[PDB]
């Protein structure tokens, strides 16, 4: 299948080049498969979602996203237009407040919270996580993060926005989930990326469309923006059948376009998320 006129990071994750625009997927397109974003809420009624959306969880006064992070990083994963796995699943769970904002606590309660009510849910294909949230090093949340990967669940986490090395921030540098660097269009490491050995991938993530409440859309960037990259091409090679929750880190990089990044300190890994789809 061929998106025309996609944005640049769809096109991205499909080429073995920067500099085009048209995003290249297998029909099946993460059918099957189930994706929980855990972040500010999801804008479920938003067309781009086409009522594959819901909330199942929220820890404050609404399951509404009141601020927008968490409908765009979940329209990277699955919304129609703007997503990686356009027929996925997508679970909000809401474990930040409206300003962005949660304690370690919250955070470490939802990640139990997925690795459980996963078998509440129909996800024939498997299950992703997509955890675009990050402070401190914490060893209890990064337990949270290996608990619920270990679970069955396919963890992304995003290396955080400090250019600084990913080994002092949580769920970050924890090493049995699927840390995620952001790149710009241009195939630049973005400027704000963090970086360190702990990274198992980059994805786009400088100038990402996507959904936004009240039913709009936006451009914004970050680490938050790369991660979503990830979690959605996780669920559409989980439908594949190409490889499974545990191993699917593991495959994406085995699988990455190789190099091709400028930026990349001495010992991080060059590699920029692909989905190898030939037609
Ligand atoms: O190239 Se794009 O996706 O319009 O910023
Ligand atoms: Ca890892």
């Known amino acids: 299948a061929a998106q025309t006129n996609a944005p640049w990071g769809l096109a991205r994750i499909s080429s073995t080049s920067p500099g085009t625009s048209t995003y290249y997927y297998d029909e099946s397109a993460g059918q099957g498969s189930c994706v929980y974003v855990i972040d500010t809420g999801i804008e479920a009624s938003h067309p781009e979602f086409e009522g594959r959306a819901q909330m199942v969880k929220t820890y404050y006064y609404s399951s509404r996203d009141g601020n927008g992070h968490?409908?765009?990083?979940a329209g990277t994963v699955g919304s129609r237009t703007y997503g990686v796995a356009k027929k996925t699943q997508l679970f909000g769970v809401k474990v930040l407040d409206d300003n962005g904002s949660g304690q370690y606590s919250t955070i470490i309660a939802g990640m139990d919270?997925?690795?459980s009510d996963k078998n509440?849910?129909?996800?024939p294909k498997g299950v992703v996580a997509s955890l675009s949230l990050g402070g401190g090093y914490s060893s209890s949340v990064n337990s949270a993060a290996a608990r619920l990967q270990s679970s069955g669940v396919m963890v992304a986490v995003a290396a955080g926005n400090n250019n600084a090395d990913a080994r002092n921030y949580s769920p970050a540098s924890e090493p049995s989930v699927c840390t995620v660097?952001?790149?710009?269009?241009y195939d630049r490491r973005s400027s704000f990326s963090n970086y360190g050995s702990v990274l198992d991938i980059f994805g786009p993530g400088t100038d990402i469309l996507s959904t936004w409440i009240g039913g709009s859309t936006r451009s914004i960037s970050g680490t938050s923006m790369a991660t979503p990259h990830v979690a959605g091409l996780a669920a559409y090679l989980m439908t594949l059948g190409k490889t499974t929750a545990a191993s699917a880190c593991?495959?994406?990089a085995?699988?990455?376009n190789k190099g091709d990044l400028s930026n990349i300190?001495?010992?991080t890994?060059?590699?920029?998320?692909?989905?190898?789809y030939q037609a």
């Not at 968490?70 to 990083?73: D, V």
């Not at 509440?120 to 996800?123: D, I, L, S, T, V």
């Open 181 to 185: 660097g952001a790149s710009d269009r």
């Open 70 to 73: 968490g409908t765009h990083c």
């Open 250 to 252: 593991r495959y994406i």
């Open 113 to 115: 919270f997925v690795a």
């Open 120 to 123: 509440n849910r129909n996800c």
């Open 254 to 256: 085995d699988t990455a």
């Open 269 to 276: 890994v060059n590699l920029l998320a692909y989905n190898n």
């Open 265 to 267: 300190p001495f010992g």
